[PDB]
């Protein structure tokens, strides 16, 4: 059993302080703590536990490198986090006999401080798409009043969940498209098999109006299952296996395809550099930058950890830096504030490494984060 360089610190502080209360005759009177109010440095870490029947999410304060809370989950749950910090939620699945018996799909909403559930909305006929956790396979509408989740079989569709009214609304028939990127209270985009993008506008009832954009990528260009999407800035960052980055601007309510950019240098792609991992890309709104997990690897090792992370100018495509992470990282993300934190998560070390986004230096870390932690989620506040 090891303690992180930040763990000892917090441990001694607690000691020193307890020892003091003791010495001053202050009696211990146990109660149920509340977590610190969500802020820019808060970071959620979801553990799909290698597709285990029950899962866990860790609420972490990225500033001090401390676990301030946790929330239990079911089979491969989809987590979401309100950017304003007013609430968190997830689409989960449980069964009546551990992994067998009656299946029950549902959405739960939690209070970011008490971490108590404020809502438990059941989803009719197990509509959830059971797949390795893809952040955008369940997303929130800009006003945080609706929850949208994908359905793969028996056919493509998305269910509408009224969080404000706490009830399942309906399933939306959609083309053979995947993922969900909400751009408005009644609008969201999808990625389709033909290479186009799908715009879905839905009312309270009736067939939704669907329209496709131009095909923005060749049939032999593969867009990773973990693209970065900044709802506020309506920016959609979608990398390919080779590191090529397609950017889509959804601010205008319609898809505007920005000039593609290559995240890896000509020289790098020559020596075999390629992106790889789980959450391979992160996008910092305010700074308008891209961060890509990369490393030297064969072309079919796209899900293996990487020890480097390169930063580039979203607009120009100018290389800005290349950090050596020092560990096998599977997923990264960043805090959306002033001097952002570069989060680097290792599914192997079940550890979350917190770095200075600017320097790329490791500031602290947090371990024992489940059995196979994979998804990092932050809130874009302010």
């Amino acid at each position: 059993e090891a303690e992180t360089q930040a763990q000892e610190t917090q441990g001694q502080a607690a000691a020193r302080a307890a020892a003091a209360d003791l010495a001053a005759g202050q009696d211990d009177e146990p109660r149920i703590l509340e977590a610190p109010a969500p802020d820019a440095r808060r970071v959620y870490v979801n553990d799909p536990a290698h597709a285990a029947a029950v899962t866990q999410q860790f609420v972490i304060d990225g500033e001090a490198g401390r676990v301030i809370g946790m929330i239990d989950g079911g089979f491969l749950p989809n987590p979401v986090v309100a950017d304003d910090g007013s609430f968190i939620a997830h689409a989960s699945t449980v069964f009546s006999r551990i992994a067998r018996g009656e299946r029950t799909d549902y959405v739960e909403v939690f209070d970011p401080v008490t971490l108590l559930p404020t809502a438990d909305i059941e989803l009719p006929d197990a509509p959830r798409f059971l797949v390795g956790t893809y952040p955008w396979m369940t997303s929130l509408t800009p006003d945080g009043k609706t929850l949208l989740f994908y359905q793969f079989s028996p056919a493509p569709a998305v269910g509408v969940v009224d969080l404000e009214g706490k009830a399942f609304k309906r399933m939306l028939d959609v083309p053979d498209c995947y993922h969900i990127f909400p751009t408005a209270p009644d609008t969201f985009f999808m990625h389709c098999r033909d290479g186009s993008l799908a715009k879905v506008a839905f009312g309270t009832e009736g067939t939704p109006e669907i329209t496709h954009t131009e095909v923005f990528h060749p049939e032999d260009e593969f867009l990773i299952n973990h693209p970065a999407y900044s709802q506020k800035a309506g920016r959609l960052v979608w990398p390919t296996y080779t590191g090529k980055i397609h950017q889509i601007d959804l601010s205008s309510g319609d898809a505007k395809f920005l000039p593609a950019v290559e995240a890896l240098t000509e020289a790098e792609r020559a020596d075999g550099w390629r992106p790889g991992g789980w959450q391979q890309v992160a996008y910092h709104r305010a700074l308008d930058r891209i961060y890509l997990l990369v490393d030297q690897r064969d072309e079919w090792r796209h899900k293996t950890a990487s020890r480097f992370v390169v930063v580039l100018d979203a607009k120009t495509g100018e290389r800005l830096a290349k950090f050596e992470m020092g560990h096998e990282i599977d997923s990264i993300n960043v805090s959306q504030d002033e001097k952002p934190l570069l989060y680097a998560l290792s599914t192997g070390d079940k550890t979350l490494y917190i770095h200075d986004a600017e320097s790329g230096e490791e500031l602290r870390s947090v371990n024992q984060l489940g059995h196979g932690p994979q998804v990092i989620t932050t809130a874009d506040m302010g």
Binding site: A51, A99, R100, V131, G132, Y134, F152, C192, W300, T304
Partner: protein
């Protein structure tokens, strides 16, 4: 070994992740929890649909199509985990995506992942 290095198949131990029929397996090798290279363990449910991949057999130099069907209705075996992705495509190309829980068609509608088998369903390119 090096995780990023090219995948080198072998045909002498089906419980190792470098066994040739596992070139695109995700999860756990059933043979490690009561099943076999191609059969589900007792009590689990055998899925019909699945993802596939063309795996090269170093023994005869031929390539076969492996149908990675899942054994379901049980919590992850937790024994012999592997994750290979030879020719694995993003979810918008499901026929080759292995992050999906391929439990469709299993008896009793079992949808929980336990382990995966590596049966050959034909020759490939």
């Amino acid at each position: 070994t090096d995780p990023r290095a090219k995948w080198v198949p072998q045909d002498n131990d089906i419980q190792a992740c470098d066994y040739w029929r596992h070139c695109s397996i995700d999860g756990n090798i059933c043979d490690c929890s009561g099943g076999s290279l191609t059969n589900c363990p007792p009590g689990t449910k055998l899925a019909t649909a699945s993802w596939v991949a063309s795996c090269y057999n170093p023994t005869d130099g031929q390539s076969y199509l492996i149908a990675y069907r899942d054994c379901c209705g049980y919590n992850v075996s937790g024994r012999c985990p592997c994750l290979n992705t030879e020719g694995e495509l993003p979810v918008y190309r499901p026929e080759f995506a292995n992050d999906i829980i391929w439990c469709f068609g299993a008896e009793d509608d079992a949808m929980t992942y336990h382990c995966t088998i590596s049966p050959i369903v034909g020759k490939a390119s």
